[PDB]
From Swiss-Prot, chains A, B:
The gene is MAP4K3. Keywords: Acetylation, ATP-binding, Kinase, Nucleotide-binding, Phosphoprotein, Serine/threonine-protein kinase, Transferase. Belongs to the protein kinase superfamily. STE Ser/Thr protein kinase family. STE20 subfamily. It comes from Homo sapiens. Interacts with SH3GL2. Interaction appears to regulate MAP4K3-mediated JNK activation. Serine/threonine kinase that plays a role in the response to environmental stress. Appears to act upstream of the JUN N-terminal pathway. Activator of the Hippo signaling pathway which plays a pivotal role in organ size control and tumor suppression by restricting proliferation and promoting apoptosis. MAP4Ks act in parallel to and are partially redundant with STK3/MST2 and STK4/MST2 in the phosphorylation and activation of LATS1/2, and establish MAP4Ks as components of the expanded Hippo pathway. The keyword Repeat does not apply. This is Mitogen-activated protein kinase kinase kinase kinase 3. ATP binds at residues 11-19, 34, 37. The chain holds residues 13 to 314 of 894 of the full protein. Residues 5-259 form the Protein kinase domain. The active site is at 125 (proton acceptor). It comes from the Eukaryota.
Amino acid sequence: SQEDFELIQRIGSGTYGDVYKARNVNTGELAAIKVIKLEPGEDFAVVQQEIIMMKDCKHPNIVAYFGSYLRRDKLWICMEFCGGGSLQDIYHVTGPLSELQIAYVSRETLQGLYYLHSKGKMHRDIKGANILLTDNGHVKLADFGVSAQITATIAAFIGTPYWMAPEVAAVERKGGYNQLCDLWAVGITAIELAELQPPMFDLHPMRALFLMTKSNFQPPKLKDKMKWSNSFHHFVKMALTKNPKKRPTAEKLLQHPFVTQHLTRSLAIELLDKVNNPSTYHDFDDDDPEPLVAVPHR
Amino acid sequence: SQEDFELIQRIGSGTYGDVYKARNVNTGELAAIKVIKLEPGEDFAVVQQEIIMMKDCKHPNIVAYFGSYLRRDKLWICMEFCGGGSLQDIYHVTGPLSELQIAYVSRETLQGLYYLHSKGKMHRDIKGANILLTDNGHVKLADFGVSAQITATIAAFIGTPYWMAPEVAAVERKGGYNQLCDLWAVGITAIELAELQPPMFDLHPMRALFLMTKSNFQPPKLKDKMKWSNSFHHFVKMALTKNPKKRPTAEKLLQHPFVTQHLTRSLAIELLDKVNNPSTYHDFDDDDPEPLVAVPHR
Ligand SMILES: Nc1ncc(-c2cnc(C3CCNCC3)s2)cc1OCc1ccncc1
Ligand SMILES: Nc1ncc(-c2cnc(C3CCNCC3)s2)cc1OCc1ccncc1
């Protein structure tokens, strides 16, 4: 029941409700609980779908589902607690991530999407706010709300299609995209972790979307042409292929040098320590540990 | 009240409900009545908006509003009766229209849109089914349901815009077009009246809209390159300008030769007679009317 957990503190805000740090009353285990307020009679098929998808995903790079409890218009969704927090929360304190840190995160995210895509699902909201870190440095993906929204909307034109002007047709269209769009978000997220914000972030949301549809649109690059290697640049160049049909899948991009190089969870531990560091030194004593083998000096 | 009219026969189907030929109980005047079934609690702001717009338009090329009556979930909207019927209804019996007939209809439609556009309104569903004819050959535009829908929807992204792939952005966009889209519909309608159906009519609605958004999209032409004049072709070429900013407005297109030439309601009377003709001859007697001036012959 809900009574098995005690909400400790709000740690974020999901697509729907608030996320709270929580503790189990008996086991003492930590967990993250998404509290969602439901209005009577409202379309439940959406939060219902999110739970099902969470319930249907068991992968080391996806936030694991513990349980869900509904009590009087208040729905709790229990999941594993990622101590590090969102990457966005991290690089807001931390500076920009390292290239190797971006590389590690990217490979793990791609591993998560690989799983989702084989299942035939898509995340459709891949960003720094949805990529979490465990205390040991593991990378998990979160927030299946958007995914759930898109699935639920699979169910009416305004006007008649054939008589629509091209600019009206662009707005009257629906669907027509697949899971390869997640790969684009990986490319944008790569930039996001590098430059503390996605490209075009200063524009209005509608204005940014309109620019992407223009025929003369060219995919973003990394501003510092010299700060990052050719692999990182090339990785983003592939991930940010405008044409979806020629865009590399999750497996093809996992075969890329930038993510196929040696990358361990040490890099995330580093990142976590920097967040736990708001100090370049500490007290110490360095002399000869054992007198028995202490080299003499006169 | 509703009791002032008696529904005679269904004459069409609007965006919302059925349209009935109707007669006034007292005056004996004919009228068209749109019967709309409303569910309790439903968004009325849309049919409410349609009435207001109809009520707000007094132009010789727009179907005039007589009244509207609501009685127990059943809303009547009374308007002038166009004896000829829809152009689509006409060319389904009639063959394709003449070039001069298409020209006459086009000028009158443009005159209607000119009025709407000066008021800052848009039709957004200009087609043969919405262009009516009076018994005397006058051309009126109808069906403000779509217009009303678009206005009412002026009031939430799925996912975050900046991380969206271009193909997702295309579907997540909204608005971004103006009344110039009506001019495109005029161009398509010109083809429709000429070839008994719009271009791409054999495609699926979604497929047709997707093709229009492609960068390599080229506006349709008239299939018979030799059946119609250069003016008609050029008229459609202007009206079907892919780029909305360079697309001629309603006034600019009214200055075009194809519609600035001599065109009278005789052409519509012709069209109406052909519909009232499902016969190339009839009984007659041709000899010398008056003997007093009858020229002799021996
Ligand atoms: N499963 C989760 N585990 C931990 C967090 C945390 C978020 N912020 C945290 C702070 C960061 C700063 N240091 C203290 C801890 S931990 C969020 C989680 O999930 C979020 C979520 C969002 C949307 N849908 C589902 C889950
Ligand atoms: N005001 C209207 N006056 C007459 C018709 C007619 C439609 N079909 C007609 C037949 C054609 C064949 N000959 C017999 C008559 S008359 C439709 C009208 O309006 C339609 C409308 C649609 C959608 N929203 C508003 C109005």
